[PDB]
A and B are shown apart, each in its own frame.
Chain A
């Protein structure tokens, strides 16, 4: 058994982490007090769920998690929430002044004051690991802490844990639920600094989650809780292979091996189905063929783009529930005759498939209906470069007038870091074009 440590940075990372760890406890039968009646090895064990949970002598299953935020109000909810007993105070790290939506403040000014404290607490989790695989980092692109402190932490993790893997769950900024005009700045600044430190990054666009919540859950104005309930399901079906018995994506290294042929092109596109409303009493259970075909509808992707006008480098199908291999291959055989699936010439046109018979768990009283079978498709398509092109364009509009730049230089940043970060993104857009065009 090899352990995975989760790190949640900023409001978006913390609130999402709280939703993920609640869902994890429901999936593994871990009560809010930390007890797990199904676990017969008291105070130890090398089971699959021990990748995310350690065990105390009293039988409490403690997440291998650390929450960090430059202000205390969001993490205080973890100290008060239903799963407060799950964590010990050392896992919850808070500062005084937040980054005020300013990457320079989260990275340079305030992050530098707290970076050693965070690393020491992570080291305390790493010392309890017999064989750490690496880290899962949850953060926003637009937040001052989610962008600023994360890129500082990712730099330091590559130093202190050079042989370890680092996967990212990143919230791409959407104006409908944004909090700052400078989120394009923070998004590009943190991508430039984190690029060579992340082995695989899963971008979730809030625009896609918002619209999926509106059109599939009939939610008029989705709040953060609505979005995080859906995001937690997508994160769970991605990390399920690390928490349960399986053979696909069983360690963080296999995520890079199966999805990232080129190191810079490490942003797989996630597609999840089905999303059914709980208020919908009469529900018709979708088949394997129907949910697999839904993996190719852009309205079900975590980032809105058109994979038809791109090229696939890698594809992974993660099924949960009543799915048999034969049904998958019949669905794939039908889909290839109809859909536009173009792979690059230097890669095999194929799918790595993983099935876990346990159907998805939904939060009781939530908006999501319990289904018999669901699938998450991870596909590294060049089409996700559209999201970079949109983001770089919004960056170029503000930066052409140097708007808001003084708040960053005022914290010790240099104007050249902006252009240096933008040139990298320009090179990244070129890397995607050279692969798929």
Chain B
């Protein structure tokens, strides 16, 4: 009875978090009213990992919705599955964070963090055995970025022996709201390197490139971007939600994916990515090849420019597990130079019989690759371009921060890049 407490913070965190709950509720047979109407035993066997059970055979997501402004959370409450959330678990302010990390982390967000920890405490106190937390947020804004990392630090203080997992959306000039996004992301990465066990790096650059180049969407919207995030988040949590030969939890994922404490930033990948051919049947070799293809990576990093430390693959749908193991071993034997030799058998594959909605079969890729340094190099370059002239810093010094905190954040992220490059050449 290992429960996961889910937390979504900010506009992006609440939008990808709400889509996550719509998607997995459908897979587990939970209607918007919280009543189960599925037809499989596998749907409910591990339902307690993400859902509480209220009276009347209702299932309530163990989710906490946080934002410094009520706008995005009103959209959730009016959204499709908005009535499935516990009403007490809506914790919101009124001022907003103004796309400012300092407001989220220091001034506006400190004012609201205590009532969020109160809701976290009530959910944790009714857990038979808490695994830890998964957080959805962006790094380019203010609430998810600044207040989200403040939550992570305070949650660790009260729950130092629980796993902290984040779905962190990286900013990109291709999909940009404000120019201060490299500042907010660099400050957040500093916090993530220290206080999370597992971060799924969801780069908006990759999501945009996939929509534009692969899915042939000339003008991608956030809904299009979040369609990929929903699909990826469903796949990476499959082995936490469904019974199988390999049952995972948040700690087993961290132990096996993270050889060194700071290198816990993962490249997600998904196949198929089909443009609306949605009826055409994909073979197991095709899923395996696309799953490792860089055009299916959600972190805008070319894996062939680095080496894989660890890889977790999950195949969903009814297929030959014999053929799945064949194709996965074939990819390793064909491209053996891209897997580090000092971690033997660093690829593990799992199979779930239940495919996601609208797919006869799929494949999700969780890789800890050294190529992820490309993502942090990109942010570090965008950061340095402005910081060398102290551009836009007054928004942050006006909230009490000083420049030294920026210098330390950039230094820590450069170290992270160097640490990934170190084991790429080990």
Contact = CB atoms under 8 A, between A and B. Distances in A.
B322 A220 contact: yes
Interface residues of B, number: 31
B172 to A, nearest CB: 32
B247 A406 contact: no
A403 B255 contact: no
B342 A96 contact: no
Contacts of B346: 181
Given A100-B249, A180-B252, A221-B321, A397 B342 contact: yes
A267 to B, nearest CB: 22
Interface stretch (B78-86, B256-264, B292-300): B256-264
A45 to B, nearest CB: 41
Contacts of A220: 320-322
B345 A175 contact: yes
A338 interface: no
B348 interface: yes
Given A179-B252, A397-B342, 19 more contacts: A100-B249, A101-B252, A176-B325, A179-B246, A179-B348, A180-B255, A181-B256, A181-B310, A184-B344, A220-B322, A394-B345, A397-B344, A398-B344, A401-B423, A401-B426, A403-B259, A404-B259, A407-B254, A407-B258
A3 to B, nearest CB: 35
Nearest to A393: B344
Interface in B351-406: none
Contacts of B254: 407
B341 A397 contact: yes
B1 interface: yes
A287 B345 CA distance: 41
B88 interface: no
A329 interface: no
Interface of B: 1-2, 128-129, 245-247, 249, 251-252, 254-256, 258-261, 310, 320-322, 325, 341-346, 348, 423, 426
23 contacts: A96-B128, A100-B249, A100-B255, A101-B256, A175-B344, A176-B325, A178-B345, A179-B246, A181-B310, A181-B344, A181-B345, A181-B348, A182-B255, A221-B320, A221-B321, A221-B322, A397-B343, A398-B343, A401-B259, A403-B343, A404-B255, A404-B258, A407-B254
Interface in A168-189: 175-176, 178-182, 184
A73 B248 CA distance: 12
B342 A73 contact: no
B255 A101 contact: yes
A277 to B, nearest CB: 16
A175 B347 CA distance: 9
A371 B344 CA distance: 40
